[PDB]
Amino acid sequence: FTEGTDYMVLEKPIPNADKTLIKVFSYACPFCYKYDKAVTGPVSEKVKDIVAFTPFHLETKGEYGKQASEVFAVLINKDKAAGISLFDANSQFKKAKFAYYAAYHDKKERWSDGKDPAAFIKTGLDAAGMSQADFEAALKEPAVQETLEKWKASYDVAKIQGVPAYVVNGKYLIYTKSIKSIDAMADLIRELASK
Ligand SMILES: [Cl-]
Ligand SMILES: [Cl-]
Ligand SMILES: [Cl-]
Ligand SMILES: [Cl-]
Ligand SMILES: [Cl-]
Ligand SMILES: [Cl-]
Ligand SMILES: [Cl-]
User: Fold this and answer.
1) Where are the transmembrane segments?
2) Residue 65: which domain range?
């Protein structure tokens, strides 16, 4: 694999990202949906022995970027605390993520274009099986707030080649357009993780 073609080196790395595969994404991004249907799960499963799969949501995209970040931060922290993989059938994050992708991209739902955040939140929480009250309580927790703080770094990473942005060890950003297969992507991630 070749620097400049398959990947690039971030001039400002994502901090505290040792042994991670970070995926910067947005619920509102059609390619994020496409790659999450086709490559994200299989590839992350293949490399789970070397790098921890670590979604980073980009809060600045779409009318409900902030709300989606809140829902995802809450659900990822809950899944992690329960020792549940983010690709597991029982992952609440996974359920919410695909509910938003289906609503936004397949059904063209826009929840009144920013003016109905309660409806947007409901879509994700209902799919995840979480109550509004539980979400509101969980959002106040330090770990959830820490996650939201970490994800602020998504904006500067997204500038390079858009979203999705798959990053190895906070340093090596894969060029999404170069990804040709599950195997090749997993091969690349392993090479990058050995650097
Ligand atoms: Cl779109
Ligand atoms: Cl994800
Ligand atoms: Cl759409
Ligand atoms: Cl609605
Ligand atoms: Cl819109
Ligand atoms: Cl900036
Ligand atoms: Cl091979």
Assistant:
1) none
2) 1-195
